Write an enzyme that holds these catalytic residues in place. Sequence first.
Site, PDB file in Angstrom:
ATOM      1  N   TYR A 185      -2.277 -12.979  -2.692  1.00 43.88           N
ATOM      2  CA  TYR A 185      -3.767 -12.641  -2.055  1.00 43.88           C
ATOM      3  C   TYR A 185      -4.710 -13.230  -3.315  1.00 43.88           C
ATOM      4  CZ  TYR A 185      -1.047  -9.507   0.669  1.00 43.88           C
ATOM      5  OH  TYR A 185      -0.442  -8.991   1.579  1.00 43.88           O
ATOM      6  N   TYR A 188      -6.170  15.055  -8.171  1.00 41.40           N
ATOM      7  CA  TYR A 188      -6.811  14.077  -9.159  1.00 41.40           C
ATOM      8  C   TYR A 188      -7.349  12.868  -8.298  1.00 41.40           C
ATOM      9  CZ  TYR A 188      -3.824  16.339 -12.388  1.00 41.40           C
ATOM     10  OH  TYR A 188      -3.225  17.170 -13.400  1.00 41.40           O
ATOM     11  N   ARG A 220       8.350 -10.374  -9.851  1.00 43.37           N
ATOM     12  CA  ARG A 220       7.685 -11.028 -10.759  1.00 43.37           C
ATOM     13  C   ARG A 220       8.694 -11.507 -11.725  1.00 43.37           C
ATOM     14  NH1 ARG A 220       4.510 -13.279 -13.886  1.00 43.37           N
ATOM     15  NH2 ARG A 220       2.237 -13.340 -13.410  1.00 43.37           N
ATOM     16  N   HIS A 235       8.527  -1.033  -9.030  1.00 46.23           N
ATOM     17  CA  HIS A 235       7.887  -0.006  -9.457  1.00 46.23           C
ATOM     18  C   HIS A 235       8.782   1.102  -9.802  1.00 46.23           C
ATOM     19  CE1 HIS A 235       4.668  -0.965  -6.278  1.00 46.23           C
ATOM     20  NE2 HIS A 235       4.402  -1.555  -7.688  1.00 46.23           N
ATOM     21  N   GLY A 261       6.121  -8.180  -2.982  1.00 47.25           N
ATOM     22  CA  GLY A 261       4.804  -8.341  -3.794  1.00 47.25           C
ATOM     23  C   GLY A 261       4.894  -7.412  -4.968  1.00 47.25           C
TER      24      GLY A 261
HETATM   25  C1  LIG Z   1      -0.402  -4.037  -4.029  1.00 49.07           C
HETATM   26  S1  LIG Z   1       1.053  -4.776  -4.424  1.00 49.07           S
HETATM   27  C2  LIG Z   1       1.320  -5.968  -3.071  1.00 49.07           C
HETATM   28  C3  LIG Z   1       1.766  -4.993  -1.715  1.00 49.07           C
HETATM   29  C4  LIG Z   1       2.366  -6.002  -0.544  1.00 49.07           C
HETATM   30  N1  LIG Z   1       1.230  -6.591   0.318  1.00 49.07           N
HETATM   31  C5  LIG Z   1       3.695  -5.261  -0.143  1.00 49.07           C
HETATM   32  O1  LIG Z   1       4.123  -5.813   1.184  1.00 49.07           O
HETATM   33  O2  LIG Z   1       4.003  -4.249  -0.510  1.00 49.07           O
HETATM   34  C6  LIG Z   1       0.505  -5.695  -5.852  1.00 49.07           C
HETATM   35  C7  LIG Z   1       1.642  -5.895  -6.809  1.00 49.07           C
HETATM   36  O3  LIG Z   1       1.462  -6.821  -7.700  1.00 49.07           O
HETATM   37  C8  LIG Z   1       1.543  -6.749  -9.104  1.00 49.07           C
HETATM   38  N2  LIG Z   1       1.484  -7.741 -10.207  1.00 49.07           N
HETATM   39  C9  LIG Z   1       2.540  -8.469 -11.275  1.00 49.07           C
HETATM   40  N3  LIG Z   1       2.148  -9.085 -12.049  1.00 49.07           N
HETATM   41  C10 LIG Z   1       0.651  -9.149 -11.677  1.00 49.07           C
HETATM   42  C11 LIG Z   1      -0.578  -9.419 -12.756  1.00 49.07           C
HETATM   43  N4  LIG Z   1      -0.382  -9.844 -13.699  1.00 49.07           N
HETATM   44  N5  LIG Z   1      -1.832  -8.935 -12.032  1.00 49.07           N
HETATM   45  C12 LIG Z   1      -1.729  -8.609 -10.946  1.00 49.07           C
HETATM   46  N6  LIG Z   1      -0.964  -8.154 -10.081  1.00 49.07           N
HETATM   47  C13 LIG Z   1       0.212  -8.229 -10.646  1.00 49.07           C
HETATM   48  C14 LIG Z   1       1.211  -5.333  -9.213  1.00 49.07           C
HETATM   49  O4  LIG Z   1       2.282  -4.873 -10.155  1.00 49.07           O
HETATM   50  C15 LIG Z   1       1.681  -4.745  -7.691  1.00 49.07           C
HETATM   51  O5  LIG Z   1       3.006  -4.155  -7.852  1.00 49.07           O
END
Ligand SMILES: C[S@@+](CC[C@H](N)C(=O)[O-])C[C@H]1O[C@@H](n2cnc3c(N)ncnc32)[C@H](O)[C@@H]1O
Lengths: 292, 292, 292, 292
Positions: free
Chosen positions: A194, A21, A175, A142, A137
């Site tokens: 970020y 995919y 979160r 997950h 993060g």
């Molecule tokens: C790509 S990860 C960061 C990875 C990190 N640099 C590491 O060491 O694992 C981004 C996370 O931010 C989250 N998050 C929670 N609430 C969010 C929101 N409203 N919008 C964006 N990201 C959000 C995503 O679900 C995701 O699990």
Amino acid sequence: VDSVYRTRSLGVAAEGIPDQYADGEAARVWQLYIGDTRSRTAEYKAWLLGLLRQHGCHRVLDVACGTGVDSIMLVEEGFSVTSVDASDKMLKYALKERWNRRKEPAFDKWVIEEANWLTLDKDVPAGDGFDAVICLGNSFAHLPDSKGDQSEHRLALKNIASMVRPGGLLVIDHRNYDYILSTGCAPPGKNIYYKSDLTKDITTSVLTVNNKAHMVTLDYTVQVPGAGRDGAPGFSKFRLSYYPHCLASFTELVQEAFGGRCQHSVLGDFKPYRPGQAYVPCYFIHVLKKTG
Amino acid sequence: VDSVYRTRSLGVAAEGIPDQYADGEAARVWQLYIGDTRSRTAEYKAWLLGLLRQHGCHRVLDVACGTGVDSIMLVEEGFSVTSVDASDKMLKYALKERWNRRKEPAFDKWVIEEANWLTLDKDVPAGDGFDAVICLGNSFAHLPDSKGDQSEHRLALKNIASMVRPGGLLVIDHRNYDYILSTGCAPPGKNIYYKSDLTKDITTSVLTVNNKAHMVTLDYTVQVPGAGRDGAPGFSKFRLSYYPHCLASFTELVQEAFGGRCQHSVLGDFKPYRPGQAYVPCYFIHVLKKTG
Amino acid sequence: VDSVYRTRSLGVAAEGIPDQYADGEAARVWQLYIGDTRSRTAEYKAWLLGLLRQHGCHRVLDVACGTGVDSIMLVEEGFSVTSVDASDKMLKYALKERWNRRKEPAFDKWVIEEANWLTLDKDVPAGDGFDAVICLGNSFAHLPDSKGDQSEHRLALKNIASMVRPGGLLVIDHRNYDYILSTGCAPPGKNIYYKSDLTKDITTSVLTVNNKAHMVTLDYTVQVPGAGRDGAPGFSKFRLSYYPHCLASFTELVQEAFGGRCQHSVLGDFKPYRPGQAYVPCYFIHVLKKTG
Amino acid sequence: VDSVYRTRSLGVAAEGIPDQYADGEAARVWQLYIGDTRSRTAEYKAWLLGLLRQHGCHRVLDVACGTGVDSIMLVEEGFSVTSVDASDKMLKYALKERWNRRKEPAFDKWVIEEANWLTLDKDVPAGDGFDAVICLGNSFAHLPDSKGDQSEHRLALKNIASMVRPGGLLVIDHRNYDYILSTGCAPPGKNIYYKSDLTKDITTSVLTVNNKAHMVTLDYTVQVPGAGRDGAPGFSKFRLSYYPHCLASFTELVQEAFGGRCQHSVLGDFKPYRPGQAYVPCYFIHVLKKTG
Ligand SMILES: C[S@@+](CC[C@H](N)C(=O)[O-])C[C@H]1O[C@@H](n2cnc3c(N)ncnc32)[C@H](O)[C@@H]1O
Ligand SMILES: C[S@@+](CC[C@H](N)C(=O)[O-])C[C@H]1O[C@@H](n2cnc3c(N)ncnc32)[C@H](O)[C@@H]1O
Ligand SMILES: C[S@@+](CC[C@H](N)C(=O)[O-])C[C@H]1O[C@@H](n2cnc3c(N)ncnc32)[C@H](O)[C@@H]1O
Ligand SMILES: C[S@@+](CC[C@H](N)C(=O)[O-])C[C@H]1O[C@@H](n2cnc3c(N)ncnc32)[C@H](O)[C@@H]1O
């Protein structure tokens, strides 16, 4: 009886053709999103580096490596970093960075490996254990609760804790699911790690089974900039899900992984958390030191 | 009214967790199958080395890289090699080998890149072209014919043709489908390139649509040597499909990709081939020298 | 590239063979569940007969016919009844009963027809309208809200409203979702209409999207009385979903379908209802007399 | 792990909503097709009635009832007919005809019931057995060979044969799979039983597993007349599959169901079949009399 015949089994690959995919709409926007985790916050860099300097940390395990963002920063700053992730689509990006920067000696010495939190102890040799294990993060959320009891959460968290050297640090976050669970809205882009340059809209669905919140699903509609007629953006969508970790359950879970032999502090955005302060954080960071 | 919720979109990954079809039953025997069938035959090594050397080839493009077995042989024997493939799940294994051997200067110089035959020109800088292009192992046949006319085979073969320098070679093979399509049986393990340790059975299905062989499907039943009770073998299946290229049409398709400006020979297994010879090849190798 | 062949299209039938999802595990317990829950309660019979009689109703439209249990009661007590439903798999059971009793003159006069609430006006000739319309059994809640605004509930309720003669009744109920949405548990078998012989457990899942209860899903685990070993019960599950209509919004939705020209009452279980009364209904029955 | 959540189980129904796939494009064209089996051929009516008159047949079993077409004709002609089918989407149409014509006494006496060829003996009381069992229009070929050996074919055919009274008749047919298997093209609309008023295009796919033809799949693209802009037709598609019964296998299978105690004759279109005549029939009809 209705037969369905696939061309090839789910999960198999083949030399001249893209994997199953890899070029759907969902995977295309998703790649723009994981690439938008670029622009780390000054606050973030300042807090994390200061924590780790103050504790004299030098070997550090990033157990939610991803594309390599947090890890690349510790390599650059001189720590001796080992980075693991269970996902190969994401590990591919870290790996590619190490190959590019190969000739810089600190990047020749960066260890990236596959590992699963459920089998960590056997995937990653603890050695004498690391000075800081990082899992930041909302990587941890997950991980669903398949068994319904949180057994899998307890097991991944124990193994993560098993990689901390006595006197060492676990820095792990989630979160604010307490807020999300009460407004029904995970608001877009209030992000402390970020700065997002993409505009996204979020629809939040919360599934409650019998009385217990079981999953938060986010549909991310991403405005993709150059994809209409006279320069206009397009919009596309992907989805991701999570375990709604409440602060008090999580605090129990995490101190239980240490058997209670830990100090434990929980920060608010990068600043302290006094339960019943006004400021509702977007993320709770827990920093645990193994005291034993 | 019915609706279907998924955790996450098809194609997306996340830090906690294994990627979508990765630890299925079929991806585990398949991983056995690509590993314990990548130990090359002396005949092949000698055949492929003598041809390249015989024509004074030095820069080689492997356009169906896979796990890298073909490129590794050539990287070792001192050729400048660039390897592309469209499958990440497969390139993963070539990338990993490059890293482990990154200290041997030839292996530091190996380029491995993502590219697809369909866009190959946009993905790989030929410059003045490579000395040989190789697409061995019956990989071209992986590309299905999705529009019913073979326009995708034509495009792909033309883009492969373009990477060949004038006076350079294209070496590209296919299984003997002519035989397969008469016996209906792709027999297991008569393989000329790699020596198979694994015991397998193959069921062959041939799909024919308004009288044209359109696809051959192989279901592999792999005997897995210690999975059962008292050391007894445990068993699993996987499936993979092919486009059944017959020698005469393929011969026409591949000349047409050089615009006729080529010299073409077809080897029997490694031996030359003439019609109605008593010896029935398992593989037809086509060697095309480009005239201009 | 991947493709997926099916024997026959989804939705088609053929003479040899059982229809697509008919003898699955879930369709077999489900068939148990509609059969051994269609033995009506004396309370219901008396309630529904006295109301119709009390208002001098004689032609009745059952717009959520199912297996016909509601219509059969009325056909027997000498009303002129027309029964529609959108589900063939369910109408099948009413049709079959009509046939077996086709020799009793009332049953020869029963009309059973296909119709859908959404197109109901195009499907059923009201003429001057029916005396009562009934939609009992919590059937209205089957209709999902697919466009996020409740435009389909509005359309359906208006088309149901139109079949009611001036001075006629609409009798339409819903489960008490208010309670369900606070306890998160639709408790099994407190049923006011039909007496259940079967033992079941229910898991209730509530889906909430950017803070609106959007769907309730019930997974039924039916204990099947002789399926195991030494007469032991054998067990199977099936699932079905509902739109969670709360009393206040539903009250507004149903008035709005008569343009306000109606008188409306809501019964508690069969008893009248007032807010904050100590007795918590399992079902809210709405009785609407149309003024003009 | 990826969860998929359905609104309701495959196979369940619910009062106000259409059943699972009842209004897809495929089911919509399919309904035009099954309704186009209307216009029975003069040849057909003449042959079948004459066969059955000459043998003095009176109770007749139609074991592939469908929408009721062949059965309605025997009812009208005075035979005492019992009609069964395993498909409810198709039985619905027969049933509806009987209800419409209820008042005509011969239609009050028509027995339609659900039955499967695999369990026929127990679904249908033989009584003293019937005078003619009919299974015509390539109904039988719908029945796949799941087990790979033709065990299921042998079992359905034995049970069908068990409903023939000694001295009675089985009339069962199959399309000419010998022709289809050799041109790869099941040509449209050369039909000997009803004249088709629809224009259809057919793509025929034949699947051969190891050397044995296992299935013929037909994609029917139907020109639907009123469905474009200024009166123009639309085109839509559905698919159906079959077991490619060759005349010699079938002749063995069918005489084996009788244990060899039968006379057996095979007609060509409605006329005799001399193997090696010029005329290639579209359908082979077998008429077997139980002589024992
Ligand atoms: C790509 S990860 C960061 C990875 C990190 N640099 C590491 O060491 O694992 C981004 C996370 O931010 C989250 N998050 C929670 N609430 C969010 C929101 N409203 N919008 C964006 N990201 C959000 C995503 O679900 C995701 O699990
Ligand atoms: C490990 S791959 C070869 C990869 C090679 N390095 C390349 O150039 O892509 C094994 C190949 O042998 C092929 N093969 C074809 N017919 C086979 C048979 N009967 N028995 C074993 N392998 C067979 C498979 O289709 C597969 O593409
Ligand atoms: C056999 S059907 C009733 C059919 C009725 N004749 C009609 O008007 O459609 C059973 C109904 O009871 C409902 N029901 C709702 N909550 C239930 C519960 N907790 N226990 C049992 N049945 C329940 C089901 O959803 C289903 O629609
Ligand atoms: C609806 S059935 C006839 C039912 C019949 N009246 C009974 O007693 O069973 C039509 C059959 O004709 C078939 N057939 C075979 N070749 C055909 C072709 N080329 N086009 C249309 N129908 C064809 C269909 O596959 C289908 O099985």
